[PDB]
């Protein structure tokens, strides 16, 4: 594909400092949907403010986990059906922790925001479109974990 290379090339810049970049993604995420903050429950406690999450080693570990699943999608960009069962089960996990499937649309916007801000003029509309397709396929797979 042409899109496959556009994804690989755009990811390279970001994939080298995944915590820095996933930090932008999650900052944006809570700026858009602060009601996601309480779903990150470590040691029984609730983060009061978005900046509280950034001091949590467990939260930051989660950023790294997210960037690793995205990296798996990129690796597998030419065929994502091989991640389907992994992703379905990832979906069920998130259903279990209280995430509503609709919140994954905000996550997608947050990803696109992060890529836009890292790539600047290199985030062409074809790059956006390609990422939107890839993320969309990921969430389709995950959505099976919420009962189809
Ligand atoms: C609204 C967005 C999200 C919320 C509120 C959320 C919350 C959580 C929570 C509470 C856990 C369990 C605690 C932990 O391991 O940190 C978890 C695990 C995880 N999340 Fe997320 N998450 C979100 C989005 C994502 C996305 C977009 C990905 C990947 C693309 C992701 C990947 C993971 C992985 C890999 C784990 C470990 C799952 C396991 O135990 O096997 N999460 N998430």
Curated annotation (Swiss-Prot):
Residue span, Globin domain: 1-147
Entry superkingdom: Eukaryota
Gene Ontology biological process terms from the UniProt entry: cellular response to hypoxia; oxygen transport
PROSITE patterns: GLOBIN
Post-translational modification note: Phosphorylated during hypoxia by ERK1/ERK2. Phosphorylation regulates the heme pocket hexacoordination preventing the association of His-62 with the heme metal center. Thereby, promotes the access of dioxygen and nitrite to the heme and stimulates the nitrite reductase activity. Phosphorylation during hypoxia is stabilized by 14-3-3 proteins.
Tissues and organs where the protein is expressed, per its UniProt entry: Predominantly expressed in brain.
Subcellular compartments: Cytoplasm, Cytosol; Mitochondrion matrix
GO CC annotation: cytosol; mitochondrial matrix
Annotated positions binding heme b: 62, 94
One term of GO molecular function: metal ion binding
Documented EC number(s): 1.7.-.-
Database matches in InterPro entries: Globin (IPR000971), Globin-like_OT (IPR050532), Globin-like_sf (IPR009050), Globin/Proto (IPR012292)
Family: Belongs to the globin family.
Subunit text: Monomer. Homodimer and homotetramer; disulfide-linked. Mainly monomeric but also detected as part of homodimers and homotetramers. Interacts with 14-3-3 proteins; regulates the phosphorylation of NGB. Could interact (ferrous form) with G-alpha(i) proteins (GTP-bound form).
PANTHER family per the UniProt record, alphabetical: BLR2807 PROTEIN, NEUROGLOBIN
Descriptive protein name: Neuroglobin
Gene: Ngb
């Amino acid at each position: 594909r042409p899109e496959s290379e556009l994804i690989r090339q755009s990811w390279r810049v970001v994939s080298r400092s995944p915590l820095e970049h996933g930090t932008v993604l999650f900052a944006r995420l809570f700026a858009l949907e602060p009601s996601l903050l309480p779903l990150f429950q470590y040691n029984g406690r609730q983060f009061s403010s978005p900046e509280d999450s950034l001091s949590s080693p467990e939260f930051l570990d989660h950023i790294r986990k997210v960037m690793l699943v995205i990296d798996a999608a990129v690796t597998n960009v030419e065929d994502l059906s091989s991640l389907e069962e992994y992703l379905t089960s990832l979906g069920r996990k998130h259903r279990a922790v209280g995430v509503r499937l609709s919140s994954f649309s905000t996550v997608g916007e947050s990803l696109l925001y992060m890529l836009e801000k890292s790539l600047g003029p290199d985030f062409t509309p074809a790059t956006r479109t390609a990422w939107s397709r890839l993320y969309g396929a990921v969430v389709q797979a995950m959505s099976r974990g919420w009962d189809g």
